[PDB]
């Protein structure tokens, strides 16, 4: 009934989405070849949301891969669960943007984005009742940020009445993979606050800290980071796929967490996350999940919430749990750390339960908090933008392509009033 169309842009989006479809298919019991092999009847009721039966048990994912270099496409087709995507959904350029937001938004977008729009159009009319779109991309690269953001703008002006989630990794000084990170991030956030409904910030620094302390992994390659991100995405849309005592749809989460149309940047966490060495000494109850949820070292952003205040927060529980224990636990965690919450909003925590745990565990959770500490991350990026833009560094590759200077000044102004109003409400 309710439908989610999935869009992956750039290298980060394609690899994350790859591990995303692996986790989804394993929850719905569909084998990597594309046929059903599950057991439970609960898994069949809600595959119309993510898949389409083509003919003879073949379920195709409702996803669209969009990039410019075939290297990511081959990394997708090589790995397992790679032969399931529809080959027509591999709409794909040839040249490559390469960390140039202007190349992602003005030159190559003008011939690739009409094509991907037509594919998305076909995929959207193939279903009946759209719930929203789900877009995964990065903010540092060029072929992900600029192209994906234009796609967001086109879709938002096309279907204005549908929800839209966007998962974006953001740059940090300690994880500085490319050099024009601020020049790409500032223009992308400028467009996202005016187009996207809500975003969930990600970064590689927090994921590496998670793999260091909580997971205690030896070699955290990109596969494990994408595994965590995939687990989060499955956790949030678990409600549309499975019944529970208290269902909370995507729009219900948005309206419970967004007090103002511009304050839609959330920090995300996932529990339980313990090393296999300590999984033997641990307990699995609601308080044990909560006191790992509300820890600052479990957020997947580089924004220490205890340096700010929480506006609103939400918890999505999965597994057979007692709601009294859930709610009294939320009351206790709001009363104890009362200073860290905003004061002019009572009952800052939305809670919901679904009666299907993820495969391999008995009970899990997903934390989505709309704090004000995110202005530290925006201030951290805007100060680097200022340091470059006062002196016109690296600018001419953008200027000589069609972009002018007032676009950069506009992005600065909007970031500055954005951090101003986060600080205001703090």
């Amino acid at each position: 009934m309710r439908e989610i169309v999935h869009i992956q842009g750039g290298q980060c989006g394609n690899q994350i989405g790859a591990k995303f479809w692996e986790v989804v298919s394993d929850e719905h019991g569909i084998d990597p070849t594309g046929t059903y092999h599950g057991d439970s009847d609960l898994q069949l009721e809600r595959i119309n949301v993510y898949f389409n039966e083509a003919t003879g048990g073949r379920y195709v994912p409702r996803a669209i891969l969009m990039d410019l270099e075939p290297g990511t496409m081959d990394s997708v087709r090589s790995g397992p669960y790679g032969q399931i995507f529809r080959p027509d959904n591999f709409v794909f350029g040839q040249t490559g943007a390469g960390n140039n937001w202007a190349k992602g938004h003005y030159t190559e977008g003008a011939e690739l984005i009409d094509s991907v729009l037509d594919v998305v159009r076909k995929e959207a009319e193939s279903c009946d009742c759209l719930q929203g779109f789900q877009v995964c991309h990065s903010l540092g690269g060029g072929t992900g940020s600029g192209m994906g953001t234009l796609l967001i703008s086109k879709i938002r002006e096309e279907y204005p009445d549908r929800m839209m989630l966007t998962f974006s990794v953001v740059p940090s000084p300690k994880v500085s993979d490319t050099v024009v990170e601020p020049y790409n991030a500032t223009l992308s956030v400028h467009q996202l606050v005016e187009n996207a409904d809500e975003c969930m910030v990600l970064d590689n620094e927090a994921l590496y800290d998670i793999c260091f302390r909580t997971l205690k992994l030896t070699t955290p390659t990109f596969g494990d980071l994408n595994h965590l991100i995939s687990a989060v995405m499955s956790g949030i849309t678990c409600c549309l796929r499975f019944p529970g005592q208290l269902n909370a749809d995507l729009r219900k989460l948005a309206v419970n967490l967004i007090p103002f149309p511009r304050l839609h940047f959330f920090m995300v966490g996932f529990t339980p996350l313990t090393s296999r060495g300590s999984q033997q000494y641990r307990a699995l109850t609601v308080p044990e999940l909560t006191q790992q949820m509300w820890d600052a070292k479990n957020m997947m952003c580089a924004a220490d919430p205890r340096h700010g205040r929480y506006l609103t927060a939400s918890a999505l529980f999965r597994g057979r749990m007692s709601t009294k224990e859930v709610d009294e636990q939320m009351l206790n965690v709001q009363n104890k750390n009362s200073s860290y919450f905003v004061e002019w909003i009572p009952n800052n925590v939305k809670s919901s339960v679904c009666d299907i745990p993820p495969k391999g565990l008995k009970m899990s959770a997903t934390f989505i908090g709309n704090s004000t500490a995110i202005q530290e991350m925006f201030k951290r990026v805007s100060e680097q933008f200022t340091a470059m833009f006062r002196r016109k560094a690296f600018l001419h590759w953008y200027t000589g392509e069609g972009m002018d200077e007032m676009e950069f000044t506009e992005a600065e102004s909007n970031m500055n009033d954005l951090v101003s109003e986060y600080q205001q409400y703090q």
């Binding site: 009847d41 039966e53 003879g56």
Partner: protein, 96 residues
């Protein structure tokens, strides 16, 4: 060439499955997956769970409620209109 056996009426034979007009025990509402493919259809009848199960709590509670059935009761204090008020009116004199 010699039609000893009459043609088996494909136009009526195609209705129940090829156009999928027959619902496999599904209510006129129930927006869900129809599994309009033979492999999935035959795999659906091998489902271990079979809808209501001890997995979801809303189903499990009703199952535990109907586990024993309707044990027993006494119908003394049940109000019987059949005794007093429906006994005044009778059926047709001749019989129907």
């Amino acid at each position: 060439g010699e039609a000893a056996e009459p043609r088996p009426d494909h136009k009526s034979q195609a209705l129940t499955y090829t156009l999928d007009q027959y619902p496999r025990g599904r209510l006129p509402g129930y927006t869900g997956f129809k599994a309009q493919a033979p492999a999935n259809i035959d795999a659906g009848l091998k489902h271990s769970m079979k809808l209501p199960c001890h997995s979801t709590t809303s189903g499990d509670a009703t199952l535990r409620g109907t586990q024993f059935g309707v044990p027993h009761q006494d119908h003394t204090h049940y109000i019987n209109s059949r005794a007093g008020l429906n006994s005044f009116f009778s059926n047709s004199v001749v019989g129907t």
